[PDB]
Amino acid sequence: LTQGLFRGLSRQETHQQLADKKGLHVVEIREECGPLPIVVASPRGPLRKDPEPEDEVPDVKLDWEDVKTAQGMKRSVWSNLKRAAT
Amino acid sequence: PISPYKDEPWKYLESEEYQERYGSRPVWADYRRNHKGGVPPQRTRKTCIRRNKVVGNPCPICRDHKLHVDFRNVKLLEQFVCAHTGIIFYAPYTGVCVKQHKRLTQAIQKARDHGLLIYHIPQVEPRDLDFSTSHGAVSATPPAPTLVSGDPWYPWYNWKQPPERELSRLRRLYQGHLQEESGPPPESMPKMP
Amino acid sequence: KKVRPRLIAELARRVRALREQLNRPRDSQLYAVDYETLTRPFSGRRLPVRAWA
Amino acid sequence: PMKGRFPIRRTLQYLSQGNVVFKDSVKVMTVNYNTHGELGEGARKFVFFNIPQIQYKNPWVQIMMFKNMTPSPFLRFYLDSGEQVLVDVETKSNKEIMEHIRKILGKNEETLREEEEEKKQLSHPANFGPRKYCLRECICEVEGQVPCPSLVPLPKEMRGKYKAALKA
Amino acid sequence: ETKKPTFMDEEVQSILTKMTGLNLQKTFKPAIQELKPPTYKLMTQAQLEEATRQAVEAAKVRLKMPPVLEERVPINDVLAEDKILEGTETTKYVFTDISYSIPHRERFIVVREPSGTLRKASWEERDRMIQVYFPKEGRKILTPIIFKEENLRTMYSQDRHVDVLNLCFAQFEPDSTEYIKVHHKTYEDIDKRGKYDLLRSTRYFGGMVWYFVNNKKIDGLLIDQIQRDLIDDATNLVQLYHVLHPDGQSAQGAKDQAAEGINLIKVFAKTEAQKGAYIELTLQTYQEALSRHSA
Amino acid sequence: RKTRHDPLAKSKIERVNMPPAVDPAEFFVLMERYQHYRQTVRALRMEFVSEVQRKVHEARAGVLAERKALKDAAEHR
Amino acid sequence: KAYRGGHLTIRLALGGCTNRPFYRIVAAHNKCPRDGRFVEQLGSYDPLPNSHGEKLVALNLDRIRHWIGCGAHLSKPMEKLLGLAGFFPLHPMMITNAERLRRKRAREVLLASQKTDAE
Amino acid sequence: PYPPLLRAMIIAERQKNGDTSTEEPMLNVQRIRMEPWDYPAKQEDKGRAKGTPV
RNA sequence: AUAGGUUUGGUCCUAGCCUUUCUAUUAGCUCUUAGUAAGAUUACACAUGCAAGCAUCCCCGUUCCAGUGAGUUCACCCUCUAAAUCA
Numbered sequence A: 001l002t003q004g005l006f007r008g009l010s011r012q013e014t015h016q017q018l019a020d021k022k023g024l025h026v027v028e029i030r031e032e033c034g035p036l037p038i039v040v041a042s043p044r045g046p047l048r049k050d051p052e053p054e055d056e057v058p059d060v061k062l063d064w065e066d067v068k069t070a071q072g073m074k075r076s077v078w079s080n081l082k083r084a085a086t
Numbered sequence B: 001p002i003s004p005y006k007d008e009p010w011k012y013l014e015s016e017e018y019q020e021r022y023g024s025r026p027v028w029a030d031y032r033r034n035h036k037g038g039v040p041p042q043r044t045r046k047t048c049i050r051r052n053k054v055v056g057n058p059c060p061i062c063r064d065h066k067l068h069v070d071f072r073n074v075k076l077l078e079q080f081v082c083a084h085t086g087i088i089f090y091a092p093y094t095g096v097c098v099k100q101h102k103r104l105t106q107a108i109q110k111a112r113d114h115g116l117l118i119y120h121i122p123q124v125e126p127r128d129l130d131f132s133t134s135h136g137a138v139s140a141t142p143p144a145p146t147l148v149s150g151d152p153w154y155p156w157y158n159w160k161q162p163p164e165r166e167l168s169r170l171r172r173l174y175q176g177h178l179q180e181e182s183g184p185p186p187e188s189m190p191k192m193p
Numbered sequence C: 001k002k003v004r005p006r007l008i009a010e011l012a013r014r015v016r017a018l019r020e021q022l023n024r025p026r027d028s029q030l031y032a033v034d035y036e037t038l039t040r041p042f043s044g045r046r047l048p049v050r051a052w053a
Numbered sequence D: 001p002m003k004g005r006f007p008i009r010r011t012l013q014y015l016s017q018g019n020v021v022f023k024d025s026v027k028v029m030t031v032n033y034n035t036h037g038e039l040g041e042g043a044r045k046f047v048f049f050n051i052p053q054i055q056y057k058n059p060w061v062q063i064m065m066f067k068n069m070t071p072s073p074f075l076r077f078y079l080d081s082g083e084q085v086l087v088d089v090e091t092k093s094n095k096e097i098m099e100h101i102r103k104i105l106g107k108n109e110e111t112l113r114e115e116e117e118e119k120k121q122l123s124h125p126a127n128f129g130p131r132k133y134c135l136r137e138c139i140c141e142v143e144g145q146v147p148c149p150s151l152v153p154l155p156k157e158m159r160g161k162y163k164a165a166l167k168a
Numbered sequence E: 001e002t003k004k005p006t007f008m009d010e011e012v013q014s015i016l017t018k019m020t021g022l023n024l025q026k027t028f029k030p031a032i033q034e035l036k037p038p039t040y041k042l043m044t045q046a047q048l049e050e051a052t053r054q055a056v057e058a059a060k061v062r063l064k065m066p067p068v069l070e071e072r073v074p075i076n077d078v079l080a081e082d083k084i085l086e087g088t089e090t091t092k093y094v095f096t097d098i099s100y101s102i103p104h105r106e107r108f109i110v111v112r113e114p115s116g117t118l119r120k121a122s123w124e125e126r127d128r129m130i131q132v133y134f135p136k137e138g139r140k141i142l143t144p145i146i147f148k149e150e151n152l153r154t155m156y157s158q159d160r161h162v163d164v165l166n167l168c169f170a171q172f173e174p175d176s177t178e179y180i181k182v183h184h185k186t187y188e189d190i191d192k193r194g195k196y197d198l199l200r201s202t203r204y205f206g207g208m209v210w211y212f213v214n215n216k217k218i219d220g221l222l223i224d225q226i227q228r229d230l231i232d233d234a235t236n237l238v239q240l241y242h243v244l245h246p247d248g249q250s251a252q253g254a255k256d257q258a259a260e261g262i263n264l265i266k267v268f269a270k271t272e273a274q275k276g277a278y279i280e281l282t283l284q285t286y287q288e289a290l291s292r293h294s295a
Numbered sequence F: 001r002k003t004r005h006d007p008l009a010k011s012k013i014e015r016v017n018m019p020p021a022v023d024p025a026e027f028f029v030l031m032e033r034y035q036h037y038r039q040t041v042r043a044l045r046m047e048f049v050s051e052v053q054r055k056v057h058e059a060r061a062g063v064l065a066e067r068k069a070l071k072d073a074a075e076h077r
Numbered sequence G: 001k002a003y004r005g006g007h008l009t010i011r012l013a014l015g016g017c018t019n020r021p022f023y024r025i026v027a028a029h030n031k032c033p034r035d036g037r038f039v040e041q042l043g044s045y046d047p048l049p050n051s052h053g054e055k056l057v058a059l060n061l062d063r064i065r066h067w068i069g070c071g072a073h074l075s076k077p078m079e080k081l082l083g084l085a086g087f088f089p090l091h092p093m094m095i096t097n098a099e100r101l102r103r104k105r106a107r108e109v110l111l112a113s114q115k116t117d118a119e
Numbered sequence H: 001p002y003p004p005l006l007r008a009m010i011i012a013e014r015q016k017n018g019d020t021s022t023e024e025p026m027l028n029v030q031r032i033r034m035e036p037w038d039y040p041a042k043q044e045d046k047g048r049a050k051g052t053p054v
Numbered sequence I: 001a002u003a004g005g006u007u008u009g010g011u012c013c014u015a016g017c018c019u020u021u022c023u024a025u026u027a028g029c030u031c032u033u034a035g036u037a038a039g040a041u042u043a044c045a046c047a048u049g050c051a052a053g054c055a056u057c058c059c060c061g062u063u064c065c066a067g068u069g070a071g072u073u074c075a076c077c078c079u080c081u082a083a084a085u086c087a
C-alpha cells in the first residue's frame, strides 16, 4: 500500500506538464463559477492551432463500482458514514 | 466556575488565554472520541454535563466553561462551519455532544439570520413571468346589485314570516310535539356583553 | 393459465335464485301488521312512531 | 473494470443521451446492415452505438436487425397506419443516420416540452401528504401554523385532557 | 409624443447597461456552496475566445435589471356584508384558489371575517398565501428579522449591500412597501458612505441610478465615474438627467448651447451640482493626469 | 360493524324509537330554505356538466384539435 | 378497487395528530375508507387558527368544477365550507342554527341581567 | 343571481377576453323544474323483500 | 467500508469466519416523570357484554367500515362493455 501510494503520486502529471505535452491551454470549468473559463496552465512554448479531435464515444475502460454508485445501485451500509475530522 | 466573558463571549477568543491554548487551530482540533472499534458510533453522547457533573472526556465546548456558544460569539461559530462549503459540521465531525451541537446549530442560524455570519445568498429569478395588471383581481370589479343595495345576497337568506294558515297546518300535524313559537330573529346577534 | 371452475358455487347460485321465485312471500305475508304490538310479524319490525296513529 | 469494448454504452447516462423519440405512429423498426464492406461502415456503427440509445427512449418499438441479407444497408420503419418507410443509409455516418430518423420520425422539441409540462402539473406544491408524492405531509410543517404535539407539547388549554378537566 | 421616459424605455436601458459594466469575475464570483470536482478541456485559442463569447452573453442574462414598479395600491374591496353571520364566527377564513395554471397575479384569495364581510385579502396577506401553498425557494412566510434597521446597519457596516438586495428581492415583491423601504434605504447608506463601486457590474446598478436621478443626487456617482476615468459614462449620466428634467435651466441651456464633453460637465458642475468645487477639483486633478499624457 | 348474521342484543330488543319534537316555526322556514338551496345546486351542477362535456368534445373533435391533426398529417406526408 | 355501489364523493380526509386535526379535501368513493384511497386531492382545511388567526382553506376550484361535472357528490361539512367560501349558497341548516343560538341567547340576557342586578 | 365568488370570476373572464358588456350574468332556473318532494316515484325501480326474513 | 482481527517458526498470495455501524423482537438488571407515535406469538379454542339502523309503513342500509395474512403470478395496462353517480 505504501510503495504503491508513493508510486502513483510520483507519476501524477501536472496541469502545466499536460499543457506542454499537448501544446494547448488547460481550461478549468468549475460548477461554482458557471462557464467562467479559468486557465490553470498554458504551454510556455508554441501554442497549437488544430482543435484536438473530439471523439463522440470515449473508449475509456470504466470501473463498475464508480458507475454502480453513479447510478445509485451501491447501497453499502458502511459507505459515507459520519466520522471524525481527518 | 463562572466565566468573566459571560457577557462578552467574543472577548475570550481574543484574549491571550485562547491564543496560548489553541492558537490558530479550532478548539476541537485535539478532541478524539473514545469508542470501541474503528468506526465511531454515528451519534455522539447526549450531553457531557449531567446534573452539574462532567463526564470523563468532555467535548470541546464542555471542557472549557469560558466557551459560550452565543449567536454573538461569531468567531466560535465560524469554527464549526465549513469555510469552503458553508455547512455546519455534524456532531461526530467535531465531537461536540448532542446538547451543544443543537445549541450551536441554533446559534449558527441566529447569527446568520441577524446578519452577523456570512453565508451564500443565491440570485433568484422573479416569481411572475408576466407583470400585467389587466386582470380583474387588480382591476375594479362591478359591485353586485344586492351589494349596492345592502341587501342579503339571496332573498331567502332573510327571515320570511310564514303565513298563518301554513303555520297552523303544522300544528295539526305534530300535535303534542310542539315548541314555543318563535318570532322574527334579532337582526344583530343579541350576544350578552 | 387456466382456472379451476368453481362449480358448486354456480350450482348453489342458480339453486338459490330459483328457490326464491318458488318461495316468493306474498304481499299479504310481507305487509301484514299486528295492531297490538304495531310490529310486522313477518320481520318483527316496529313501524315508525310517527306512523302508529 | 467494466467488461466489453466501449463499456460506456452500458451506462444509464449514455442510454439517456438518445435524442430520437419516435412518434406514436412508429411501431416496428428493422435494420438490415452488412458486417463487411467499407460503404456500410456507418450502418454498423449505428447498430453498435445507437440502437441501444433508440430502444431506450422507445421501449415499445420492436427493433429487429438482419446481417448480410441484402447488398446494401438500409433501415425500414413500420407505422401504425400501415405505411413503411425505407431509409437507405449506405455511405452515411452513424450520427447522420441518427439525425435523419430524428427529422423524419422524431418528436419535435415542442412535443417534448409539452410532455414535460404534464409532469409538472402532477406534483402540485400545495397538496399535503406523504413525501413520496408531496413536499410536506402535514400542515404543521408550514411556518406559522399550529405545531405538532410531538416536538412542542401544546398548551394544556389546547390538550383535550385539561380542557375536559374544565368541562367536568 | 414626448412623454416622461420610463426606465424600461429601450433608449434608457441601453444607457444604463453601458454604465453598469460587465466584470465577468464579479458576475461569476466563486460561491460558498457544496463544491464538486472541477472539469478540464483542452481549448485552442479560437475556442477559448468562443468560450469567452458564450460566457459574456451568459453574464448579460444574469445582470438583467429588475423592472422598477410603483408601490402597489392596497386592495380594499368587499364582496358581501351579511349580517346573519355577525358574531357567529370567531376566526377569519382565508380561501386560496390553489391552481397550477393560474398566474399568482391573477389569483382569487378571499377572506370571510367574523363580522360576516367577505373581503378581498390585502396585498401582504395574498403573498403569504401564495407562499404557503406555492412555496418558492428563498421566500419566507414571516418577514426575516434581517430587514430591521438594527440588522441592516450591521449588513451595511460589512459592505454587504449587494447581498441585502438579493434577500429583499427574494423575500418581497418589487412593488411591496417593504421592498421599496429596504431598496431605497440601501441607496442612502451607499451615498452617505460613498460606496458606489460596490453595486457596479450587478443587476442593481440601473435601479441605483434610477433612484438617484429622480432625487437629483447624482453628484457622488458622477464624481466616482470621473475619478475612475469613466468620462464617457459620466457624460451619459448627465445626458440622462437632462432627458428626465427637460424643463430645467441647465437642461435647456445645454440643448441651446449644444454643450458636450468637458463643457457639458462644467455647466452642471457650477450651476446645479451641489459639489461644484469638488467636481471642478475632480476635473482639476484629472487635468493633471491629462497634462502628463499630452506631454 | 355488525353483519346481517349477527343477532340483535337482547338488551336492545325492547328499544322503541322516540319522535324528535318539532318546532312548527323552524320546520317550515327550514323546509322552504332547503327547497331553494337544493335547486340552485341542481342548477349549478348541470352547468358544470355542460362544461365537462364541452371540454371532451372540443379536445376530441374541436376545430383547434382538428387543425393540429391536419398540420401534423400534412407535415408527415 | 370495485365497490358494490357508490359514487364519487368530495369529502374531508382527517389527518393530523391527537388533539391536532387537519383535513384534506379529497375526491374519493362513497364506500372507500375515510383516510383510505382517493381519486384526487382538491385542497386542504386547517381547522385550527394559525399565527394570524385565520382558517386556511385551499380549494382547487378549477378541478372541483370538473369533478362536480362528472357527478361528484358532497358531504355535509364540505357543502358548508363552500358556502362560507362563497362558491355555493349558504347551507340552510347553518342559518337555522344561528337563529336557535340567538333565541337561546335571548333567554340568556334575561337570566344574566338578573345576576348582575343581584350582585 | 350568481353566488358571490362565481360572479366576480365570470366578469373578469368577460373583461379579460375583451367583452365590455356589463350585463349582469345570471342563470336559467326556469328550465329547472323543481318537482315536489312527495311526487310519486317509479315503483318499477323499487326492490322487493326476499323470501328469507333475514 | 477509509476498514480491522485471525492461518505460519516466519514471509507473501488466496480464502472463509469474525470485529467495528444502523434497526427490530425477546431476556437480565435497572425503570423519577411530561407530550406524541406504535402495541396478542398463534387462520387454535372462547366467558358470552357490546359493535346496523334510519325512516309516517314501502324502500334503503346492514355487501360499506372495521379485521386477518391462512391460502396466493385473477392486484397493474389495453380492447370491448356492464352496474353505479351525473334530476
Ligand code: FES
Binding pocket: D138, D139, D140, D141, D147, D148, D149, G016, G017, G020
Ligand atoms: S405531523 Fe402535523 S399534526 Fe402531527
